[PDB]
């Protein structure tokens, strides 16, 4: 069977759709990231989960398109605006997801906001 999404079993990949958010005098997608492969999972807030790294949200919009649509903090973005956000540096990701040129983007995050997964890190 030709499965089109990228959901395995435990993690669910879900789509997000951020519409243009004007913050002050900039245009932002609302959310912020922590970084992907350019970061060290041995000391990362949301990459302590997967050593496979990837760009994840560290903050979303305080009340904007990110949280409005369905983008949550911690959720790793694997797909942004048909560009694939999987395996990209913080720098390159920033210059795509928080760039001010684009208004609305079709994103896909893999919910890592799970349980049983995401090793305790002595916090759990």
Domain CATH number, residue 82:
2.30.42.10
For 101, which DSSP code? S
Distance of alpha carbon 103 from alpha carbon 25, whole angstroms? 14
Q: Convert 66-102 to b/e letters by CB count within 10 Å (16 or more is b).
A: bbbbbbbbbbbbbbbbeeebbebeeeebeebbbeeee
Beta carbons of 16 and 78 less than 8 angstroms apart: no
Assess contact for 16 and 97: CB atoms under 8 A.
Answer: no
Q: What does each C-alpha distance from 41 to 46, 52, 81, 98, 104 come to in angstroms? A: 8, 8, 25, 22, 30
The total domain count for the chain is 1
* Structure tokens given for 44: 């990362």
Backbone φ and ψ for 78, nearest 5 degrees, come out as: -110, -10
Q: Is 121 left (phi over 0), alpha (psi -120 to 50) or beta?
A: left
Is the Cβ–Cβ distance between 121 and 48 less than 8 Å? yes
Provide the domain limits for residue 33.
1-124
Please check whether residue 119 is in contact with residue 49, taking contact to mean a CB–CB distance below 8 angstroms. yes
Strands (E), the chain: 13-18, 21-23, 26-28, 32-33, 57-59, 76-80, 105-110
Cβ–Cβ < 8 Å for 25, 115: no
Encoded tokens for 31: 């959310």
């Amino acid at each position: 069977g030709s499965y089109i999404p990228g959901q395995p079993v435990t993690a669910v990949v879900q789509r997000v759709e951020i519409h243009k958010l004007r913050q002050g005098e900039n245009l932002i997608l609302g959310f912020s990231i922590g970084g992907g492969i350019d970061q060290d999972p041995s000391q990362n807030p949301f990459s302590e989960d997967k050593t496979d790294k990837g760009i994840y949200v560290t903050r979303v919009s305080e009340g904007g398109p990110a949280e409005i649509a369905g983008l949550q903090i911690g959720d790793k973005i694997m797909q942004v605006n048909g560009w694939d956000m999987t395996m990209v540096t913080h720098d390159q990701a920033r210059k795509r997801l928080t760039k001010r040129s684009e208004e609305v983007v079709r994103l896909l995050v893999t919910r890592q906001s799970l349980q049983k997964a995401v090793q305790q890190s002595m916090l759990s």
